[PDB]
Design a protein around this ligand. Structure first.
Ligand SMILES: CC(=O)SCCNC(=O)CCNC(=O)[C@H](O)C(C)(C)COP(=O)(O)OP(=O)(O)OC[C@H]1O[C@@H](n2cnc3c(N)ncnc32)[C@H](O)[C@@H]1OP(=O)(O)O
Lengths: 316, 114, 56, 316
């Protein structure tokens, strides 16, 4: 289930995990497990450090879509508490690709909206691999309005390959729903903080991502179009996707230096999948620090500051 | 031509005409983005896709705008949005409806997230 | 439409994403031809702004 | 195409219409048409007066659903002008059972929303016999909001057998859509006047009928449930429907004396189908008179008066 370039680490982990079982496997073997496990872990850590010292925009994309990575549910469980899931768009259905709800954080209730992908293949099929139908965006609009009503802070997550290009999505006003979202979210009276956990972008994800603060993970990409699509359009070939990724600058440092985000959230060594708990701790600390200073502003001044930052968009 | 067809003659007033493509990303496609920018600019004779002209309609003042599709699929640049905001400001300070005619193949990729 | 074709790997409905179809699916208000467009816009703006209708 | 009890009038009209053709039919016949036509018209008028002197709640229902009667489109054409039809619910479809749009009346633009049934069988099938799907109600909500925005008066019509009890209607939040309509329409800042042209009721029709004024035609019924349904439920038999209609009081005088409406709009003798133009003139005069006095009120005082009239509902 690992990527192409993760073979030196992969081989050694097929031997470290067994040693715990070998402690009482059979034949009365209780070998000197401790020292061998520690040595193998040292070797694996050194190999991982050497491998991930060299990083590439394609490697960045692969880690952003590694098929083992904390989704919105994982970050909610491992960084928030008392999460009550609210569903329903009031209109047609409750699309699984967006998960929203209300939770408490350090005694302060918050509204959490973000996409969810799924670990197993069945869950990935059920959640449409994180591609939101328009009714999901309407649900997000409703939740944001509800949070606006009861003076509630809003913190949202952005982990989605792209807005679903399906027959039903186009039949049901995809562009209309996204525009309606993008209009109201510029009138909210509460702070909006967003994170780019996993892989997010494609413009459609911006319907829950126009706020006072924007943050990105170390191994996350946020592009207007998918690198494969960009290659197949501009380079007239799909296999030149790594070249398109290098040219675009979808990697975290490129999008940070372009003054489009606030800060890059560091990951545990080995990426987020190796130690999701440390990643959750870092994300919790970052979001708490970001929410701390923002709450000082009053609603009118907050909206005015957001509007001025809205004008700050673009080079011209 | 669309603006001429809609707005009354003798009242065409272009707004925000000083803005021009000021590329800052230096994109490296199969062709350099400057190549397509210059080609479209010299072909269509216009600075960007959006064209703004405050006019008057049947004695009622009105603002208008339109997208030139030939400008790289009429993509929305920073100039496009800034000119739209200028038209909105003119409408707010001088009370009059605003009209925009949409024609775009999508967002300008070579300007990325901007 | 090509992206949707490669996504659903099937056939689009007849008249896909046409103004006639998209007014059936409720995302489109009205279908107006260009020669009538000037008068129609003037009338609608005059009514909505509550201004007197233009004289034709 | 006439009802059961209209046989004396029906026979004579099969002879009056021919005399115009007989004036130059064949064989050089140009008989003394004028006097015979006038005598036959006198006889027909006297028979119609005698027949409709005797009226019954069932007869009231039959005239309310006579398969020849001015619908919303007819009243718009023959009493309003400069009608621009706006369609689309922005969500799923544009259900034909509700026709809405914006038109000018005596130089003042108005918003006209009302159900439409159809004359021919094909049109009746296409319009679902005036049964609105929930998306139509969402469209009506959108139009009412638009009229509220640009300080525009709202005048609506109610001619529908009942909210559509279909699979799709229930699947798509029928009750939710009707409730959403009924909540917003109590917050509009502009007067709302409604008419009960044709046959309307069943509760669902109230989603466009909660306003400062309510008016009814002389031969129209406005009931909570359909008389046939009321019979089949309470009397355990469908054929006792006329008895249920008599007991309920769905007829216009009963609903007028119950202080639920403002006034009964008279019809041309012979009902509305005999002279739809005179009916349109009466309806235009009534609506103009009703709109005249209401426009004096300011928006805040108008909403307060509506709320007080809202409290005035019910016996307790
Ligand atoms: C993700 C985004 O927002 S941009 C993604 C691209 N756009 C889309 O996916 C939506 C529609 N996709 C399309 O291909 C078209 O817009 C369609 C379907 C309307 C087809 O219209 P067409 O008649 O084929 O126009 P076409 O795509 O050729 O546009 C004309 C020119 O504009 C260019 N163009 C159009 N949109 C864009 C864009 N967003 N960025 C850069 N160039 C663009 C094309 O490259 C083309 O240039 P070329 O003729 O010199 O090669």
């Amino acid at each position: 289930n690992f990527l192409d370039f993760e073979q030196p680490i992969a081989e050694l982990e097929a031997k470290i995990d067994s040693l715990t079982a070998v402690s009482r496997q059979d034949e009365k073997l209780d070998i000197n497990i401790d020292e061998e496990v520690h040595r193998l872990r040292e070797k694996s850590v050194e190999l991982t450090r050497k491998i991930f010292a060299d990083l590439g925009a394609w490697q960045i994309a692969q880690l952003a879509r590694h098929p083992q990575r904390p989704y919105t549910l994982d970050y909610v469980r491992l960084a928030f508490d008392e999460f009550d899931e609210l569903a329903g768009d009031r209109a047609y259905a409750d699309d699984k690709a967006i998960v929203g709800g209300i939770a408490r954080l350090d005694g302060r209730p918050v509204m959490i909206i973000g996409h969810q992908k799924g670990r197993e293949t069945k869950e990935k099929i059920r959640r449409n691999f994180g591609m939101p139908a328009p009714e999901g965006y309407r649900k997000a609009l409703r939740l944001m309005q509800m949070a606006e009503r009861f003076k509630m802070p809003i913190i949202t997550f952005i982990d989605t390959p792209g807005a679903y290009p399906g027959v039903g999505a186009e039949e049901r006003g995809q562009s209309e729903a996204i525009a309606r979202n993008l209009r109201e979210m510029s009138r909210l009276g509460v702070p909006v903080v967003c994170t780019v956990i996993g892989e997010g972008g494609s413009g459609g994800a911006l319907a829950i991502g126009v706020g006072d603060k924007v943050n990105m993970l170390q191994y996350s990409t946020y592009s207007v179009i998918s690198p494969e699509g960009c290659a197949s359009i501009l380079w007239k070939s799909a296999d030149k996707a790594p070249l398109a990724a290098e040219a675009m600058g979808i990697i975290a440092p490129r999008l940070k230096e372009l003054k489009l985000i606030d800060s890059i959230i560091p990951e545990p060594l080995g990426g987020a999948h190796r130690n999701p708990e440390a990643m959750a701790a870092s994300l919790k600390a970052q979001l708490l620090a970001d929410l701390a200073d923002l709450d000082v502003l009053s609603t009118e001044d907050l909206k005015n500051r957001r509007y001025q930052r809205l004008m700050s968009y673009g080079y011209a | 031509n669309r603006l001429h067809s809609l707005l009354d003659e003798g009242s065409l007033v272009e707004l925000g005409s000083e803005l021009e493509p000021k590329d800052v990303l230096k994109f490296r496609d199969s062709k350099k983005y400057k190549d397509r920018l210059a080609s479209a600019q010299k072909e269509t004779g216009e600075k960007d896709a959006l064209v703004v002209m405050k006019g008057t309609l049947y004695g009622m003042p009105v603002v208008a705008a339109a997208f030139e599709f030939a400008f790289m699929g009429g993509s929305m640049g920073s100039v496009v949005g800034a000119r739209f905001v200028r038209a909105v400001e003119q409408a707010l300070e001088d009370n009059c409806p605003l009209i925009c005619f949409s024609a775009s193949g999508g967002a300008r990729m070579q300007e990325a997230l901007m | 439409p090509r992206v949707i074709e490669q996504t659903v790997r099937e056939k689009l409905p007849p008249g896909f994403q046409r103004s006639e179809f998209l007014i059936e699916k409720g995302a489109i208000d009205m279908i107006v031809r260009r020669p009538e467009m000037r008068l129609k816009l003037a009338s609608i703006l005059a009514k909505l702004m509550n201004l007197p209708a233009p004289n034709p």
